[PDB]
Amino acid sequence: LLAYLACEKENWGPHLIVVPTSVLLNWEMEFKRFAPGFKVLTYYGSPQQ
């Protein structure tokens, strides 16, 4: 769905994926193996980083 929105429409602005903690890595890998044309951010890991 997001890939279709990014291809058919010129809008691929910052979207949010709210997920449980356990799948936090899996999602960023889910379209790493799959469509990699997006820039993914992972938010976790102490205040510093």
- Using CB under 8 A, list all residues that contact another protein: 29, 32-33, 36-38, 40
Query: Least Å distance between CB 19 and another protein?
Result: 19
Query: Least Å distance between CB 36 and another protein?
Result: 3
The two structure tokens encoding residue 4: 């279709």
Enter the DSSP assignment of 38.
Answer: S
Query: Least Å distance between CB 49 and another protein?
Result: 18
Compare residues 45 and 47 and give the one whose CB is closer to another protein.
Answer: 45
| CA 7 to each of CA 2, 12, 36, 39: distance values in angstroms, whole numbers, following the listed order | 9, 9, 13, 15
